[PDB]
Amino acid sequence: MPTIKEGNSRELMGQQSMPNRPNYIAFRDNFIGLMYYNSTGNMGVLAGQA
Amino acid sequence: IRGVLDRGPTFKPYSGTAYNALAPKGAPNPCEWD
Amino acid sequence: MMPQWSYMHISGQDASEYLSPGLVQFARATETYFSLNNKFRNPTVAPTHDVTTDRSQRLTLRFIPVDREDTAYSYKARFTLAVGDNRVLDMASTYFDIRGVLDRGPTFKPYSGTAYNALAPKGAPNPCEWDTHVFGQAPYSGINITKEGIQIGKYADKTFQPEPQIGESQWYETEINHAAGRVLKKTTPMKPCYGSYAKPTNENGGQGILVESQVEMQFFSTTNLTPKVVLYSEDVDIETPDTHISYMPTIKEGNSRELMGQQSMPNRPNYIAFRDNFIGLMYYNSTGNMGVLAGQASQLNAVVDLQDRNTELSYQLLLDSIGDRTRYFSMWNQAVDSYDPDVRIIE
Amino acid sequence: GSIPYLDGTFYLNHTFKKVAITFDSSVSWPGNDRLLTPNEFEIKRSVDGEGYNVAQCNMTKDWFLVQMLANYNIGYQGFYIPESYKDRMYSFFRNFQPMSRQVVDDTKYKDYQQVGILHQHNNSGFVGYLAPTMREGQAYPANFPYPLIGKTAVDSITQKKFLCDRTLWRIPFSSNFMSMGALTDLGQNLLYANSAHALDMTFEVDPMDEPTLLYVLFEVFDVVRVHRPHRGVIETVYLRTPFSA
Amino acid sequence: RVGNNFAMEINLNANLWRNFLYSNIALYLPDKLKYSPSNVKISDNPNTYDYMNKRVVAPGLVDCYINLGARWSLDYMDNVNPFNHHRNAGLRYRSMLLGNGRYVPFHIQVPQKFFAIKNLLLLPGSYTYEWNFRKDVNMVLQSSLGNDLRVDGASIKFDSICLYATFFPMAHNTASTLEAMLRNDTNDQSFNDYLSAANM
Amino acid sequence: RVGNNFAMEINLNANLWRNFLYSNIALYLPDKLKYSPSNVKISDNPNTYDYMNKRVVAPGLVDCYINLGARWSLDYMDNVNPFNHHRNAGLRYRSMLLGNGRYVPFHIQVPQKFFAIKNLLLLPGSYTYEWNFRKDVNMVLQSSLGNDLRVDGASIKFDSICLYATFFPMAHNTASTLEAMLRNDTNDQSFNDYLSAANMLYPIPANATNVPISIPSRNWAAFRGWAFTRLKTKETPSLGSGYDPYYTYSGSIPYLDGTFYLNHTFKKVAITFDSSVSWPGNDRLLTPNEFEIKRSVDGEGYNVAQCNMTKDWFLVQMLANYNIGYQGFYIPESYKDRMYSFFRNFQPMS
Amino acid sequence: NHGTEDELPNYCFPLGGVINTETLTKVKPGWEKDAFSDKNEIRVGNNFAMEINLNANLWRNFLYSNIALYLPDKLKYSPSNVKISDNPNTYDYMNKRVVAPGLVDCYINLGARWSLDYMDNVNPFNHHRNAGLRYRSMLLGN
Amino acid sequence: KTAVDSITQKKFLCDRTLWRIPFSSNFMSMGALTDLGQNLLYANSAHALDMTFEVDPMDEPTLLYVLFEVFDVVRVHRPHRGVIETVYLRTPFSA
Amino acid sequence: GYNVAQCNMTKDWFLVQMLANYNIGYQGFYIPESYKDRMYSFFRNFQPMS
Amino acid sequence: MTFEVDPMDEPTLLYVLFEVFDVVRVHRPHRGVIETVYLRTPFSA
């Protein structure tokens, strides 16, 4: 940025552009985190109705 | 499971640009000023 | 102990013994199409007696040489390898720990290219002076040029200012009226920019030789008289530790317009190190420098070598047969010699 | 980002200095004069203890021995590359990377000069200043870095270290550190069954300018027995020892 | 044209090498080695993408002449999570699995990992199977920069969850026989957790 | 701006390819193809780095249009040690193991290789263990250029050498019992050298083409067979002594390391017992009187695998290495085809 | 398509490292001319430079060479003022038909792992990057 | 369409390996101790051996390296504390 | 809903192919052992895209 | 422990001696054999 001054000017002709940092986003390996485990408050359940 | 996901605005699955990649990084677009 | 252990299968019988016979049979018969193996645990219990000592005992011992003899082209080391009572030693578990100093010499160059001005064209020259002409650059744009040099706020510190690293930020013509640069005196041999190096003489990066800074400004103008440019001339300890001249325009000493055309080229890469598996370090198959392994009580040498034998190679071939020579193992300098297939055979 | 605690993307194993294990406030484990430095597990040594190091890095002979045995039972009959099927992704060896390099000796190189980025020049006139921007400056003999090679190489100093990512440091509760069964020899010793013991551990780590955690896994038996006596009836018996829940 | 032609020089190889260093190492350098840009608005939140993306870093930090001829990891990078990177093949692939776009309708299959039930052979009867799923983006999602997805606008909504189960079309007489056997305590199933440890 | 912009053209790909050829092949070309630079001082010693570094080579020798569309090794480079190169990963790694600097304080662990003691289980007692270590840089060190390290300033000094030994903390009763058993001759340990061979070297004068060898009548019981290669005298230090004054080379040493690279220079082999009997004789081979390694055009028909190797030879090598040959030819199982094996290293070209 | 690592700019410079020098005269200190020579060349400001995106270029060349040219004929067009065979099963034909690089440019399906829907039904084996065929070809010679 | 009259060249490389000629009746590996090596004709008497190698010419001194495959063995005896006795046997080609 | 593996393939089909090629399917889905997953095999050649 | 001291215009040190038993037991079973047993309590090394 050649100037913190708004509006188009000969000055801005010298501004330089640079690509944004790559940023991958996705679900985790083996869906880690999706299901709760080892948490007393959100404990899974497997029981015979009987 | 089926649902919807919005990776948000910070998601950028690549390096570099998709626009005017061959243009020198300081070269300007044909413009006009006061 | 006991109870919970057997019940939980932490110990005790194997599934084959604890499960009912019908099930075992069934399991064996269904195996290829429907497996039950992973739903029954099989305990693994380590032995509790007659394996290890309860007594105090070192796992590793270190022996100091009893006699040493540092000679012209060799080194002899003698030890008293002692195997205590109630002990056994597997020779494969022995090795000579060595400490020393090594100078790879001046021809060692662990890389290709240069470490200095790699981006500079191979023929481009450093701003210089000769017999007196000048060929330079003034990238620094100052406020004004006085007899005190170039104003930067507050004149510049000759020892390091201006800094060659600094130039103008824009890409277009701004029109610099008060320019400053850095230049080498005709007393500093000419060398291409590429590969050019000169040790700094001050915490600020200045490389000006100290006598005692000897920097001297030189003012310049075009064709009322007012210097448009000023250069900070100096003598540096110019070197070219990793490149050489690819093009000498004249076998004539001294700086000249001629030398402006010399070309620089990186020196050939040259790796130097110990050999694969420390080959060569120890003597083998040499009657004159024969190893020794003898009982102090027998004094008879268990080692009997021949010039006819090839221990080093034998070991090379032995390794290949028992593992993947492609893997590296720092401990023994186990890193096989290879080459790029694309280099040996051009495709 | 990655969550090592859950995914195994471990990367801070090289920061451990040593480990001292003590039972009942007085007894040193494993004691028995086993290790070169019997009173504790020394993971790495700094220059002063070079002689006790191995593999061309700052790791100690003692530690290398324990890790090799614990992971592959290799150690008493020579050291060699473990068989590939035993050397997995999260294994010791496969992840072990010893490194070395040389740097100017600031205290012995007569002409030494401490020059920072602000004043370093190399490629001046062809590169942007303190940024990935447009070129600026002018051609000029570089003033950095110092030559470590050639007839002019500067007095240097050697640095050794190592990386050991995506693995866990191991100290088996086995008399010879070897794997002779899930249910170890020590784990079955009367001295550990006929009575209760207190345990003290002391870790020495490299300092980090940020809050960290020392993650300890106490290896035990975490088992379940499933009973299914009747239609729609599942009964379970959990047992975790040691460290019963 | 009298003489040689007009020519411009460039060091291809040096350039490439440089670009690799700057892109892969420099930019991942710790924040402490970085500095804020002039005349450019930047977030106050360091856990932000804007922040990580605007902080500037000097290439001279990791230039082509860095530790020349050595096989050395930067002492600055040793304690930096190596996995949070654009060169993480695993994460890269998982990202592409979803697509190249911000907005994604998803369909996935999640496995049961709990050791006591993961390999269990369930006998006939009716069972209540219930589980909890996280909604926290910082937990369910992963980024290469490791920025704060909560602040950073990531979002996730669960539309439907089903339970699938496949059955070996076992012969009835056989299945029945196997059942009887598995109903005896002597033939009780048993499992242990692979990790087998108390975590502290 | 009226019209298109100002532009400069460059062939990126061609350039890269070129740079690769010049750097990796050209510069390694034999000295004979090189020439001295004008107005530039250069050493008189060809075994010198200065020399190897200053000799200039024309890129046109190995330019991007070299043997276009072919998979061919340069006929000039065939007899050039392929291991002496900056692209030798093994050597490169060992070099970096030490660091990137000239001056290095070192700490290493050296293994015992001698076959009679390397795996021996030593019983209780006190033993005298002594060994000799070389100091010769051309021997202990290795360079990619293979220059003369003696002349070239390499130096090495041994400060201290220790002996380490690890012991299984075996139960005393057990250890004692094992000892007793191992003390009986019936339980004597035994080892054999992996190589299992008597090694001989016979000189081949420059330009010589015939190499006759004679072995005075002797006993052959238990004889296993023959194995052979060809080495360069320059790359073979003399081992019949503690020091070789004429050894001015520091590259790979095939005789010791296995970096063999001259096997393609063999034409044929004739074996004869008692001045009259041809082995194997019996009318076994296509050219029964000898082992023909390769044929030149005139004998095409007897060649195989799309190269100049003979059917006979291919058959022998395949059998000898993998027992493959009587029941068809096929790629040997990977575990049998190792690093120093025949097939894995066989490269036919045209 | 993970893009390109083109963060740093790439430049090419003049052989002499400077080309737009301006003739100057040395001066002495209120100043007086010096007579050093009457004509010294000094470059005032930065050097002359040309920019190029190395990485983007390489990536492009790869796309055009490996995918574009293999695109189906239907996406192609005949060149102007250039004789071309009538036989589509001909080499001349396949070699002259022209294809627009914009079809498979560096910004194609950015950030995705996707095979072109156009190429799915195109025999993947008929290609210069078929190692097996390449090797068999070289086995015979060049 | 303009290619010049050509000629074909074939060769081969076979680096980092040793040429082999086993002393076996069918060249196969049927045991360390070969069938021929145990033939009465090679035991009941001594024989002289002549070998003739033909190689490509090289403008530099070289060496023909021959490995005579045999048995290179040792038997270790340890009758008493601090006593190591060995028996070396190399055949053929006894030292 | 009837699709699987993050592509347009059906659960049914994925099941049949896995069983037919490696007998994998009734006791969970997992990557087949390399020696069973050859050049012309199902899994090794399966590429789901989005 | 909390110490209160007079202020000094220079960096100083508070030197604390933790009184314990620092002992050794020497065993000399055979010719040229010295075995030792060190024990420091409290504050074991």
Swiss-Prot record, chain C:
Compartments, as annotated in UniProt: Virion; Host nucleus
Induction: Expressed in the late phase of the viral replicative cycle.
Positions of post-translational Phosphoserine modification: S141
Assembly: Homotrimer. Interacts with the capsid vertex protein; this interaction binds the peripentonal hexons to the neighboring penton base. Interacts with the hexon-linking protein; this interaction tethers the hexons surrounding the penton to those situated in the central plate of the facet. Interacts with the hexon-interlacing protein; this interaction lashes the hexons together. Interacts with host dyneins DYNC1LI1 and DYNC1I2; this interaction might be involved in intracellular microtubule-dependent transport of incoming viral capsid.
Purpose of the protein: Major capsid protein that self-associates to form 240 hexon trimers, each in the shape of a hexagon, building most of the pseudo T=25 capsid. Assembled into trimeric units with the help of the chaperone shutoff protein. Transported by pre-protein VI to the nucleus where it associates with other structural proteins to form an empty capsid. Might be involved, through its interaction with host dyneins, in the intracellular microtubule-dependent transport of incoming viral capsid to the nucleus.
Family affiliation: Belongs to the adenoviridae hexon protein family.
Further details from the record: All late proteins expressed from the major late promoter are produced by alternative splicing and alternative polyadenylation of the same gene giving rise to non-overlapping ORFs. A leader sequence is present in the N-terminus of all these mRNAs and is recognized by the viral shutoff protein to provide expression although conventional translation via ribosome scanning from the cap has been shut off in the host cell.
Name under which the protein is recorded: Hexon protein
Source species: Human adenovirus C serotype 5
Upper lineage: Viruses, Varidnaviria, Bamfordvirae, Preplasmiviricota, Tectiliviricetes
Part of the whole protein covered: 6 to 402 of 952
Swiss-Prot record, chain F:
Keywords assigned by UniProt, alphabetized: Acetylation, Capsid protein, Cytoplasmic inwards viral transport, Host nucleus, Host-virus interaction, Late protein, Microtubular inwards viral transport, Phosphoprotein, T=25 icosahedral capsid protein, Virion, Virus entry into host cell
Primary location recorded for the protein, binned into one broad class: virion
Species whose genome carries this gene: Human adenovirus C serotype 5 (HAdV-5)
Physiological role: Major capsid protein that self-associates to form 240 hexon trimers, each in the shape of a hexagon, building most of the pseudo T=25 capsid. Assembled into trimeric units with the help of the chaperone shutoff protein. Transported by pre-protein VI to the nucleus where it associates with other structural proteins to form an empty capsid. Might be involved, through its interaction with host dyneins, in the intracellular microtubule-dependent transport of incoming viral capsid to the nucleus.
Cellular component, GO annotation: host cell; host cell nucleus; T=25 icosahedral viral capsid; viral capsid
Oligomeric form and interacting partners: Homotrimer. Interacts with the capsid vertex protein; this interaction binds the peripentonal hexons to the neighboring penton base. Interacts with the hexon-linking protein; this interaction tethers the hexons surrounding the penton to those situated in the central plate of the facet. Interacts with the hexon-interlacing protein; this interaction lashes the hexons together. Interacts with host dyneins DYNC1LI1 and DYNC1I2; this interaction might be involved in intracellular microtubule-dependent transport of incoming viral capsid.
Membrane-spanning intervals of the chain: none
Location(s), subcellular: Virion; Host nucleus
Portion of the full sequence shown: 453 to 802 of 952
Keyword Ribosomal protein: no
Protein name in the entry: Hexon protein
GO term, biological process aspect, one: symbiont entry into host cell
Induction: Expressed in the late phase of the viral replicative cycle.
UniProt family annotation: Belongs to the adenoviridae hexon protein family.
Gene (UniProt): L3
GO molecular function: structural molecule activity
Record-annotated site: Involved in interaction with pre-protein VI: G325
